[PDB]
Nucleic acid binder design. Structure first.
Ligand SMILES: Nc1ncnc2c1ncn2[C@H]1CC[C@@H](COP(=O)(O)O)O1
Ligand SMILES: [Mg+2]
Ligand SMILES: [Mg+2]
Ligand SMILES: [Zn+2]
Lengths: 79, 49, 1362, 270, 49
DNA sequence: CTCACGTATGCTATAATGTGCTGACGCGG
DNA sequence: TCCGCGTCAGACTCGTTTATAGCATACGTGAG
RNA sequence: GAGUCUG
């Protein structure tokens, strides 16, 4: 969160993986312009990803599943 | 160090024998140094310069 | 480009030509007038490339349009100027030149290859003497040196059919002719026939060299240089200073030397010069090349302009300053700043004051970026000018960027990881950085001008690693020991102490309040003191069996102050935490408790609250320091005059004859040391209480609110030791030698020192200050050796599934339990289902983390010994398992896989040493030691337990001990060990084995000064070999004449007595030898250096008597100065000068041969029929007697144990525990808490390699040293498939060698000895696949650990396919 | 333990024969006729003379050995061009040659930036003059004072004394880390050029089609070669007045595009 | 932040572009080290994947 | 297309022919 | 006897001496 | 490099 990132560590577990997953999500919002699930509330992309992880919306597995979905929709459109 | 003579001694250091080897050093203001020293076998040696 | 590995090998002449883009023929640099490169000179554009981007020299082609267009006229390629940093050239040498690195670098490769001494080769190289290359006529064989005149003789007689030459041509020919294959076979044949012990090593080493030479595909001729490479220009630049002058690299002077002499050699060869002159020029050419490669190795280095030796190629790589340590293992960095630090008490723990102008500059690109997205800046140049003008809208944008962006603060020195922390910055007007108080501990930050580095994490990844891993809030516990580093100090402690501590009645004694709110209202209203005793109603919130909190309300007597502190206290904690008077010791426990019950965010908030309230009440209090606050005891002068007439009486007894310099030194130091304690204890009784306050009626005693006493008792700042020097007696001061001055300082600082006392103080002071400057270096060098050795160690696996572990017992040294088993096995994976006493039901499982709850259960059952899983016994190859390690002490839970454990271990061992160097030294003046280790007095009743003890009964009735290792223990009723007590040799025991003693009984007395030589047998005393002047010395007295004998050692002894061992021999009335009860040994006690015997020969002794007093001068001071070398000796695995002997194999022993006195102890085991026979010195006396069934590693001799011998016989857990305990002894003496698991990491790295016997299916054969992990891998596949089974033996490597033995040469080179490392790697054709951290940091890649472990493991699986 | 290259060489020279007058004449006649041994013996016997000149020529440029070797080159030319028919001794003639070759080498090799003998000879006269001035003027020579004495140009004297300014090793008293790379632009400056170059492409697709076809093909922005007002005629324009009117017309509309986007005077300072 | 020449300019551009992405390269100090070891006559090559 | 300008290699004749700073750290392998 | 090691950043300032023949032909490129 | 410093 804002102050401390302990809760978000408790969701995923490995501090190292927390950082990778929050990074990947922050990159989506930074580049892709992906809409945030929680109200922004004037928060930087680093903190929003940690909010989403804390509440348990964002996760390595979930991100991978939606990557496949958008990627297969694009394959459908190309063919 | 003032020019003159100085008498010093390695307090052990060399040879775990632990022999105190005494030495004289003659220091001039200008010139080569004149050393006298003992060896573990009590032989007096000269080192010029 | 992205590559797998790096390989190093010898450069072929033709290889060197490949890199070259031309031969530089001329020394010409540039033209003095048109400052452009000369023709075929050192900066030739035709060779190295164009001076300006896409422009030829004569200027015919310009602009990016012309690409690779080599101008016909001048001969310059139109490409970027960048090329001149990458393109190399070469030099055609007239004479072959030896490469210094393979010649001079020890051992040397050219010498070892030819089996020819260096001296011989050099005589050949400087053209003093010829060497034979080959003579079919065995007349002259191979490598036989001939002088000038020796060459004339054979030349007439044989000539022609024998080939002998001079200089590097000769050695190159000798190298070309040598057949690596054939010599390998010849050397193998020699080892088969007659393998002499020491020359087997050297032959096996040349065999390994020959084998490795052929496998590398390196050719020995290439050790001699025919072509010489030239470094690209920009890497040896000639640039114009502003002053119009030029400045150039020294490599240019060295290249110009080489070219001038080489070209002059070409000339003198064209001119057919006489050979004396050709020779001189060939010598000078080799001198110039050797200066260019490595200047200073080939003798006197070539001095340039000042007199300083020119910096050569090797010098730019080698030194710490080389390129490794300076530009590659660490660098200067962008988006970095610094300034003075100052307090920010208003800050929360996760914040820091960052000056406006500093932050403006650091976040420049981030501002530019937002400015363009708002469309306030049209482009970058306009954004820059808006910032330069510092416009009002820019501040608002900068405020927006810094929001939730973490910044790294760093303080030198960075001893441990908390020397870098991340904060959220708070923009502040003013030039100073504002630091949060509670983290000042981790930085060792005090605001008397210290500065800090600021660094901006740029990427989203770096921001997240700073916020999650490196944030202040998230790094609360020390990674070294489990404790919180974020701990109140100074003002905060003093304030909370002032609030909690109670006074008699005061305002509003015995009132009643509704909650802490009525209390705060009362205090602030001015109707109640904070120290009033008062009954208040507080509602504590205690955790239940689940996550739900239970609420409990009850009336408890407290002060007003403690009630108000309860308001800060989070729900969950008991009221009993605040109900005591709080000091720093209690507050640290408070925050740890809160962390383990409630969690991180609550403790973070609670910590800030404590800091705010602590400062707030500290200031309300108005506590200060007057001179009357320093109270001198009324009874100082008495204690001192008593002590002073006493020491005077011993000085008068010194001229009389009962005293050596050492004895009286000890006696005077003991008298003053006890006087100092007495005066200090007088001051502290008089000061600590001596508060006469009238309670509600009559007088009472309570604790003093004297300012300095409160400061000391709270632990806010000074200790009792400092206040001794203020108000009591300053004490005995210690000289820079460590030896203590005989005259103590009687006075204190309130009293004021006189000129002599002050001058005498200076010695200790200045030695302290010099110690911080000079000794810090060795501490830091130890940190760096540790780090290099344990860089690779990373958590690789979760559970290796091992049962193996080391039995950890509770350390109970010096009566009072030093370190409890609970804390020692707190946060370590258990192993073997360990239940309760009654073996009928499992209590604890196998793989289970020892939490505070499990540990509390352990204490109710009183478990003494527990096998726990350790790093050393972990089976994981190329790292360690989360379970073997246990809890990340810094996090307070199980370690995360990917964490770089080794680094944390090395840092955490290294830090205290380096900090305690500067710390204890500037802060103390005198040495307040206590040597009174005479009598053991037992604290609690029990029965005496003596393990390992062999004592003889003396005529007094008393048990006089004659064992070396003696451990007196105090057993209770149930039968647990609770107190220990190291009894020495020469001790009188009050009671014997297994006898009852009451509380406060003395059980053993011994003299500390003098270790006596105590005889077992009774009879007459004989002087063997004790010739006066030869071995001893005679010193006579007056009137009657008491002579005393002093045993001069071999140090003062004459050549005549060297071979004689002097010993007091026990004969009987007949003058026959008395035997030692039950053995064949005749009594004889070998007297060491300066053994001062009183009683002259022929004196009837009884048994148990003191023969001889060897003086035991303990000139050691209690500091890390003496301690750290012990630690460094342990980690470096040094054999002591007198190792104690151990039995190699179990089985039954009798004596065989003797060399005069030298024992040849013959072990003849029971099952194992082969004997093991040892030569032993005569004077070294055995603990064991004769036929005993002793196991592997039973102690035979008196002496310290070598870690090598422990490992080799007992094994891993034995040697690991020996190191852990012997190191920890030192750090514990200085009050330093480091967890054993860190030391265990480094010992694992020590036990990395193993020697092998026999062959398997790979290339092992006799005695190759290979890493343990790799031979285990082989053994796993071998045992499944079969093939030749391989016996192994683990080897200990001490730190420096262990780091050089790593199979990465990039780590070995970066560490030390870079020249030697690269020659050995170059000759072996070694390939570094970059597994380690240092390797990846050098190439600037992702670390294989922490964040990088995810990515790195993805690359390793990309090696399996695509 | 004779390890030193110098002491080894001087040992070898001492081991030589010393020549007389009649011996010099006999060997010299055979030497010019082209005797192998005669040339070698005359050279080897006269090495000691080179050492004598080399000994009083140290601490000026090269090392003793360096001068000893270059001096030896003079000895060889001396033996080649010696006249035994002239009664006058060899030692006298050789001394010239040995000093000539040593001096010439010391004038070339010594100086990092290779200084031509012409300038070096001029420099000699300037410095000798400075010495005589210093003896009588208690102070040291000024540039103008030296120029007055030689009747030469002040600028010429200053250029010469500037070339006398020797350069010390940059790595030696480090200086390398103080002195920044002037040719390499900071990422700040390089990023600014990227912004300009990118804006130009967008600015090219914002003006007239014939206003960005002669404005860019002139500066070499889109085209391949940077042409001039007169050279734009090679494409299709084929005009001199109409090219100059249209070049400036493209720039005037673009000046208003920088005044409205918000640069102009903002990007004028820079 | 230090040597990587292309990397530092590219990342500057990204930070003004607001990408906050690294795009790393090869540190120029290491390129020098290689050149300095080859100047010693030791072949030190990068072996590819 | 020719000369000046910048740079380089050349020769000179009493006889002379053999050198020449800074020292002292301390522990280990 | 030799050679290898000996905390980590920061601030500033200074500093870069020597004598070396003159003159004629020869070798080579640039400018008008 | 030789300095005088600040931790
Ligand atoms: N000489 C030193 N070497 C290493 N660290 C130091 C030194 N002096 C100070 N420090 C660090 C350690 C503690 C911190 C505060 O020190 P000060 O107050 O002297 O700065
Ligand atoms: Mg300080
Ligand atoms: Mg301080
Ligand atoms: Zn050109």
């Amino acid at each position: 969160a804002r102050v401390t990132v302990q809760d978000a560590v408790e969701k995923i577990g490995n501090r190292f993986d927390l950082v990778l997953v929050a990074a990947r999500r922050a990159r989506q919002m930074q580049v892709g312009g992906k809409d945030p699930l929680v109200p922004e509330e004037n928060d930087k992309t680093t903190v929003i990803a940690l909010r989403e992880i804390e509440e348990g919306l964002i996760n390595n597995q979930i991100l991978d599943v939606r990557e496949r979905q958008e990627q297969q929709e694009q394959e459908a459109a190309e063919l | 160090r003032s020019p003159g003579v100085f008498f010093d001694s390695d307090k052990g250091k060399t040879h775990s024998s632990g022999k105190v080897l005494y030495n004289a050093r003659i220091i001039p203001y200008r010139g080569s140094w004149l050393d006298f020293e003992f060896d573990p076998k009590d032989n007096l040696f000269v080192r010029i310069d | 480009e992205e590559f797998d590995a790096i390989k190093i090998a010898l450069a072929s002449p033709d290889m060197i030509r490949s890199w070259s883009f031309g031969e530089v023929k001329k020394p010409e640099t540039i033209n003095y007038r048109t400052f452009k490169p000369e023709r075929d000179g050192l900066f030739c554009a035709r060779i190295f490339g164009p001076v300006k981007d896409y422009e030829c020299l004569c200027g015919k082609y310009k602009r990016l349009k012309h690409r690779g267009v080599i101008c016909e006229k001048c001969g310059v390629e139109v490409t970027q100027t960048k090329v001149r940093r990458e393109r190399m050239g070469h030099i055609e040498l007239a004479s072959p030149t030896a490469h210094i690195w393979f010649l001079k670098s020890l051992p040397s490769r050219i010498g070892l290859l030819l089996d020819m001494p260096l001296r011989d080769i050099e005589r050949v190289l400087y053209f003093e003497s010829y060497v034979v290359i080959e003579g079919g006529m065995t007349n002259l064989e191979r490598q036989q040196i001939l002088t000038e005149e020796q060459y004339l003789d054979a030349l007439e007689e044989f000539g022609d059919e024998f080939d002998a030459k001079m200089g590097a041509e000769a050695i190159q020919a000798l190298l070309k002719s040598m057949d690596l294959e054939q010599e390998c076979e010849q050397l193998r044949e020699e080892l088969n026939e007659t393998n002499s012990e020491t020359k087997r090593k050297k032959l096996t080493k040349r065999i390994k060299l020959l084998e490795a030479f052929v496998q590398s595909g390196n050719k020995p001729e290439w050790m001699i240089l025919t072509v010489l490479p030239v470094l690209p220009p920009d890497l040896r630049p000639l640039v114009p200073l502003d002053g119009g002058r030029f400045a150039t690299s020294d490599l240019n002077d060295l290249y110009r030397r080489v070219i001038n002499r080489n070209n002059r050699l070409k000339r003198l060869l064209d001119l057919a010069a006489p050979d004396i002159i050709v020779r001189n020029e060939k010598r000078m050419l080799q001198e110039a090349v050797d200066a260019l490669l490595d200047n200073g190795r080939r003798g006197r280095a070539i001095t340039g302009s000042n007199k300083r030796p020119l910096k050569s190629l090797a010098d730019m790589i080698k030194g710490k300053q080389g390129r490794f340590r300076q530009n590659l293992l660490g660098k200067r960095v962008d988006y970095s700043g610094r300034s003075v630090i100052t307090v920010g008490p208003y800050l929360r723990l996760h914040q820091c004051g960052l000056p406006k102008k500093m932050a403006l500059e650091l976040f420049k690109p981030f501002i530019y970026g937002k400015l363009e997205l708002r469309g306030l800046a049209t482009t970058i140049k306009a954004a820059k000018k808006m910032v330069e003008r510092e416009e009002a809208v820019v501040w608002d944008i900068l405020d927006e960027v810094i929001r939730e962006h973490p910044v790294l603060l760093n303080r030198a020195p960075t001893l441990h990881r908390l020397g870098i922390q991340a904060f959220e910055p708070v923009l502040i007007e003013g030039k100073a950085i504002q630091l949060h108080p509670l983290v000042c501990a981790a930085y060792n930050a005090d605001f008397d001008g210290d500065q800090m580095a600021v660094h901006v994490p740029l990427t989203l990844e770096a921001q997240l690693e700073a916020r999650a891993l490196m944030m202040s809030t998230n790094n609360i516990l020390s990674p070294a020991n489990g404790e919180p580093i974020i701990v109140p100090s100074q003002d905060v402690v003093l304030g909370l102490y002032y609030m909690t501590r109670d006074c008699v009645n005061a305002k509003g004694e015995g009132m009643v309040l509704t909650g802490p709110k009525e209390a705060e209202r009362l205090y602030r209203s001015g109707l109640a003191s904070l120290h009033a005793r008062v009954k208040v109603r507080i509602t504590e919130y205690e955790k239940d069996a689940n996550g739900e909190l239970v609420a409990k309300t009850s009336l408890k007597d407290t002060t007003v102050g403690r009630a108000i502190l309860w308001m800060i206290v989070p729900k969950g904690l008991p009221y009993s935490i605040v109900n005591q008077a709080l000091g720093k010791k209690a507050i640290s426990k408070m925050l740890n408790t809160c962390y383990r019950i409630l969690g991180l965010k609550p403790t973070v908030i609670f910590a800030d609250q404590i800091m705010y309230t602590g400062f707030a009440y500290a200031a309300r209090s108005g506590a200060s320091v007057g001179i009357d606050d320093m109270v001198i005891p009324e009874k100082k002068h008495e204690i001192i005059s008593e002590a002073e007439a006493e020491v005077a009486e011993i000085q008068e007894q010194f001229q009389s004859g009962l005293v050596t310099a050492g004895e009286r030194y000890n006696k005077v130091i003991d008298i003053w040391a006890a006087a100092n304690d007495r005066v200090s204890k007088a001051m502290m009784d008089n000061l600590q209480t001596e508060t006469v306050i009238n309670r509600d009626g009559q007088e009472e005693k309570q604790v003093s609110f004297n300012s300095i006493y409160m400061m000391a008792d709270s632990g806010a700042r000074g200790s009792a030791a400092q206040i001794r020097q203020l108000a009591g007696m300053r004490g005995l001061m210690a000289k820079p030698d460590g030896s203590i001055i005989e005259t103590p300082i009687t006075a204190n600082f309130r009293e004021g020192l006189n000129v002599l006392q002050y001058f005498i103080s200076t010695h200790g002071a200045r030695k302290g200050l010099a110690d911080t400057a000079l000794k810090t270096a060795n501490s830091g060098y130890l940190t760096r050796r540790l780090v290099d050795v344990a860089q690779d160690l990373v958590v690789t696996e979760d559970d290796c599934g091992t049962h193996e572990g080391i039995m950890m017992t509770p350390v109970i040294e010096g009566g009072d339990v030093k370190e409890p088993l609970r804390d020692r096995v707190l946060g370590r994976v258990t192993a073997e289902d360990v239940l309760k006493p009654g073996t009928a039901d499992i209590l604890v499982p196998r793989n289970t983390l020892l939490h505070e709850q499990w540990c509390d259960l352990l204490e109710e059952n009183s478990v003494d010994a527990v096998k726990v899983r350790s790093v050393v016994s972990c089976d994981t190859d190329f790292g360690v398992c989360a379970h073997c390690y246990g809890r990340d002490l810094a996090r307070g839970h199980i370690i995360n896989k990917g964490e770089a454990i080794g680094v944390i271990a090395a840092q955490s061992i290294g830090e205290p040493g380096t900090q305690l160097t500067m710390r204890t030294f500037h802060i103390g003046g005198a040495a307040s030691r206590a040597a009174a280790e005479s009598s053991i007095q037992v604290k609690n009743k029990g029965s005496i337990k003596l393990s390992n003890v062999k004592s003889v009964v003396n005529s007094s009735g008393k048990l006089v001990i004659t064992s070396r290792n003696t451990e007196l223990k105090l057993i209770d009723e149930f039968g647990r060990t609770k107190e220990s007590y190291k009894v020495p040799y020469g001790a009188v025991l009050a009671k014997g084995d297994g006898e009852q003693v009451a509380g406060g009984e003395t059980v053993a007395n011994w003299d500390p000064h003098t270790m006596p030589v105590i005889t077992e047998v009774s009879g007459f005393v004989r002087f063997t070999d004790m010739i006066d002047g030869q071995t001893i010395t005679r010193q006579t007295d007056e009137l009657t004449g008491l002579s005393s004998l002093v045993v001069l050692d071999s140090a003062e002894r004459t050549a005549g007595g060297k071979d004689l061992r002097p010993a007091l021999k026990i004969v009987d009335a007949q003058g026959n030898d008395v035997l030692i009860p039950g053995t064949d040994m005749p009594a004889q006690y070998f007297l060491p250096g300066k053994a001062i015997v009183q009683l002259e020969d022929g004196v009837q002794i009884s048994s148990g008597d003191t023969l001889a007093r060897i003086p035991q001068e303990s000139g050691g001071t209690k500091d890390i100065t003496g301690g750290l070398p012990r630690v460094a000796d342990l980690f470096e695995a040094r054999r002591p000068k007198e190792p104690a002997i151990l039995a190699e194999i179990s089985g039954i022993v009798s004596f065989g041969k003797e060399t005069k006195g030298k024992r040849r102890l013959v072990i003849t085991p029971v099952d194992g029929s082969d004997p093991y026979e040892e030569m032993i010195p005569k004077w070294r006396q055995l603990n064991v007697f004769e036929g005993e069934r002793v196991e592997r590693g039973d102690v035979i001799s008196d002496g310290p144990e070598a870690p090598h011998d422990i490992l080799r016989l007992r094994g891993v857990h034995a040697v690991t525990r020996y190191i852990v305990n012997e190191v920890q002894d030192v750090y514990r003496l200085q009050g330093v808490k480091i967890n054993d698991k860190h030391i265990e990491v480094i010992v694992r790295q020590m036990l990395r390699k193993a020697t092998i016997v026999n062959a398997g299916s790979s290339d092992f054969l006799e005695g190759e040293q290979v890493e343990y992990s790799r031979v285990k891998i082989a053994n796993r596949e071998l045992e499944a498939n079969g093939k030749v089974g391989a016996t192994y033996s683990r080897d200990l490597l001490g730190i420096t060698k262990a780091s050089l033995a790593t199979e990465s040469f990039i780590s070995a080179a970066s560490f030390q000895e870079t020249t030697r490392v690269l020659t050995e790697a170059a000759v072996a054709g070694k390939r570094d696949e970059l597994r380690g951290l240092k390797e990846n940091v050098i190439v600037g890649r992702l670390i294989p650990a922490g964040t990088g472990y995810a990515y790195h493991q993805d690359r390793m699986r990309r090696r399996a396919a695509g | 333990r004779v390890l030193d290259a110098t002491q080894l060489y001087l040992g070898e020279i001492g081991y030589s024969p010393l020549l007389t007058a009649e011996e010099e004449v006999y060997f010299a006649r055979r030497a010019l006729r082209g005797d192998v041994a005669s040339r070698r013996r005359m050279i080897e016997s006269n090495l000691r003379l080179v050492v004598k000149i080399a000994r009083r020529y140290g601490n000026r440029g090269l090392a003793l050995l360096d001068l000893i070797e270059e001096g030896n080159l003079g000895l060889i030319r001396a033996v080649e061009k010696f006249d035994p028919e002239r009664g006058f001794r060899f030692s006298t003639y050789a001394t010239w040659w040995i000093r000539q070759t040593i001096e010439r080498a010391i004038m070339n090799q010594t100086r990092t930036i290779r200084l031509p003998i012409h300038i070096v000879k001029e420099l000699n006269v300037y410095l000798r003059t400075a010495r005589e001035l210093s003896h009588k003027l208690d102070h040291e020579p000024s540039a103008e004072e030296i120029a007055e004495q030689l009747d030469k140009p002040v600028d010429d004297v200053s250029r010469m004394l500037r070339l006398n300014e020797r350069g010390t090793a940059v790595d030696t008293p480090a200086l390398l880390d103080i002195l920044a790379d002037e040719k390499e632009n900071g990422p700040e400056d390089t990023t600014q050029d990227d912004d300009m170059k990118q804006s130009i492409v967008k600015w090219l697709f914002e003006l007239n089609a014939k206003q960005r076809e002669v404005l860019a093909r002139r500066f070499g922005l889109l085209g391949y070669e940077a042409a001039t007002l007169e050279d734009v005629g090679r494409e299709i324009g084929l005009t001199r007045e109409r090219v100059r009117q249209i070049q400036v017309e493209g720039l005037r509309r673009l000046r208003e595009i920088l005044q409205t986007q918000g640069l102009n005077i903002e990007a004028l300072f820079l | 932040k230090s040597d990587d020449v292309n990397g530092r300019t590219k990342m500057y551009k990204n930070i003004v572009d607001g990408n906050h992405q690294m795009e790393p390269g090869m540190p120029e100090s290491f390129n020098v080290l290689l050149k300095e070891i080859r100047s010693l006559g030791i072949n030190i090559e990068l072996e590819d994947e």
